[PDB]
């Protein structure tokens, strides 16, 4: 997963 920081881990 290459998600933005505020996304859920």
């Amino acid at each position, epitope marked *: 997963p290459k998600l933005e920081p505020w*996304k*859920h881990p």
Partner: antibody
Amino acid sequence: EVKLVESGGGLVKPGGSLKLSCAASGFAFSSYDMSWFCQTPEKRLEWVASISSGGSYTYYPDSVKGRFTISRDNARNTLYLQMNSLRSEDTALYYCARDYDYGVDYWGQGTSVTVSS
Amino acid sequence: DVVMTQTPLTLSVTIGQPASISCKSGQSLLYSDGKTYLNWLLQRPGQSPKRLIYLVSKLDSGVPDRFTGSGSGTDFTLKISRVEAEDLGIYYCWQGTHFPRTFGGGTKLEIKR
């Protein structure tokens, strides 16, 4: 090729509801976070909603939180935005988008919403 | 919440010639993870937004290397080494480090004649 075709826009009254749809094809829909954006008639872009690939997590700016609901039918490759308590300000062109590569990589074509009495 | 200020508002430019556009954030886009979530997108007239840049400088693979994104902190630049006819449109920068995502206001790119 990745493809996103939004539908459901039209004229609604202030206070009303409208549910938008986004038919996704050409990729494994259920493996990606999805989003909604809008472009106001003066061409401001704005973030509207995001949902985790699985559908567990949903996220909203304060301006839509409580009013709008994002969800998805993975079995059926579709993204949704149930909009309630519409106000003139939500008058925009609404875009479905795919969240990948530390942001957003694809945009659909847009469906147009006007909130007016 | 994070303010994104793009400058100039429109820019007329010349087929063959370079161009640059600027985008400032009211606050740092650097995340406590080393990665900077600063994006560029193009909307051509009547078309849908098209990713151009992500993480400051990574090029979308449909886009030619004529375009380079750079900057750090609060200042970023999109530059076009030589402008073609199809570069016409609105360029937006946008941030996804801080919740909620926010957008700059758009730089309209125009062609001289």
